[PDB]
Write a protein that binds this ligand. Structure first.
Ligand SMILES: Nc1nc2c(ncn2[C@@H]2O[C@@H]3COP(=O)(O)O[C@H]4[C@@H](O)[C@H](n5cnc6c(=O)[nH]c(N)nc65)O[C@@H]4COP(=O)(O)O[C@H]3[C@H]2O)c(=O)[nH]1
Ligand SMILES: [Mg+2]
Ligand SMILES: [Mg+2]
Length: 87
RNA sequence: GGUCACGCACAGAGCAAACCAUUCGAAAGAGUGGGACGCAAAGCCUCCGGCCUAAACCAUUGCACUCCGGUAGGUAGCGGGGUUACCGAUGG
């Protein structure tokens, strides 16, 4: 199951794009290093976030410590990603 | 002369990008005043394509690194099309 990139789900769609990036950046970067965050609010991409880490154990600790967290008054559904980012 | 096209002018007009001020707006963007980048319809209309915004209503639990919900607003100075018009190259 474990992977590098973090896939966040069930996020608040009312939140603007830029702020969501910044809100997730500040919250998560206490676990490890971050290269980029990808978020869009297209029909297919709503309530979703992608975090580009370097190591697994940071991302694992990011996942296992806050799964179900009421971020912006909504539970965070946190599970791993599948494909390596094209960067 | 009319009409339909056309723009190498002539002649009298017209409009106003950017920026600034101010109002409206959630925003894109619009109004107004100053100001001219340009414009042969840069007059007027969103019917079609594009592009831009997304606050609200409805829809949506979605795995991306092309871009993609409905709806609503916007752009006519992004094209298409509709509609109106000044001048007239011994002009076609
Ligand atoms: N009366 C009349 N004359 C015409 C017309 N078409 C062409 N001309 C003549 O041809 C010149 C160059 O035309 P342009 O390439 O459209 O280049 C023009 C045009 O792009 C622009 N312009 C000026 N006035 C207007 C206007 O009322 N509407 C538009 N759309 N553009 C204008 O400025 C340029 C220079 O303007 P001008 O000093 O008048 O110089 C004009 C004008 O003398 C027309 O339909 N009516
Ligand atoms: Mg003149
Ligand atoms: Mg003409």
């Amino acid at each position: 199951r474990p992977n590098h990139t973090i896939y966040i789900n069930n996020l608040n769609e009312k939140i603007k794009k830029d702020e969501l990036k910044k809100s997730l950046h500040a919250i998560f970067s206490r676990f490890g290093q971050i290269l980029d965050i990808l978020v869009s609010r297209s029909l297919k991409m709503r309530g979703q976030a992608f975090v580009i880490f370097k190591e697994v154990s940071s991302a694992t600790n990011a996942l296992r410590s806050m799964q179900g967290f009421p971020f912006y008054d909504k539970p965070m559904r946190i599970q791993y990603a599948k494909t390596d980012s094209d960067i």
